Design a protein around this ligand. Structure first.
Ligand code: JU0
Ligand code: CL
Ligand code: CL
Ligand code: CL
Length: 138
């Protein structure tokens, strides 16, 4: 297993047509997972499954600018399950990140951070065993 938290450099940032694939297994008693597409200290796209927020499962997405979190975008479709293997695919498209989990479209997140070629790190944290993290151009 890769060490979590894991940093995946994204050389030259992101660009439309870039597909990021994360394979892992959720830990059995999971509480939280996060993917952080970072522009230096800023978080262009935070993708955050929460397994127990007031006894509900929700994915929270947001952006952090100068240490300030913005307006959350929330999705109650929640494909993750404690103990189970997953695949997250994040496709960069011109207006948004497009996320599919286990081959089913989940959500899109409109670009707030405009300088895509400065989004040059992906952090992966939380309650997973991380198998692989990679990218390719489609
Ligand atoms: O709006 C999103 C923010 O919400 C709140 S902060 C917030 C409070 N009030 C309003 C807003 Br808007 C935001 C959280 O505390 C933030 N957050 C979560 C994590 C985190 C850290 C990990 F190591 C990890 F494994 C993980 F899965 C998640 N770090 N920071 C972030 O999710
Ligand atoms: Cl709102
Ligand atoms: Cl920007
Ligand atoms: Cl790669």
């Amino acid at each position: 297993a890769l060490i979590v938290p894991y940093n995946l450099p994204l050389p030259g940032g992101v660009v439309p047509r870039m597909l990021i694939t994360i394979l892992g297994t959720v830990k059995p008693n999971a509480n939280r997972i996060a993917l952080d597409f970072q522009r230096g200290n800023d978080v262009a796209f935070h993708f955050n499954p929460r397994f127990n927020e007031n006894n509900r499962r929700v994915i929270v997405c947001n952006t952090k600018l100068d240490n300030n979190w913005g307006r959350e975008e929330r999705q109650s479709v929640f494909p993750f399950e404690s103990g189970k293997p997953f695949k997250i695919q994040v496709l960069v498209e011109p207006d948004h990140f497009k996320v599919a989990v286990n081959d089913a479209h989940l959500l899109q997140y409109n670009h707030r951070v405009k300088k895509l070629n400065e989004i040059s790190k992906l952090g992966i944290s939380g309650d997973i065993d991380l198998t692989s993290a990679s990218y390719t151009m489609i």
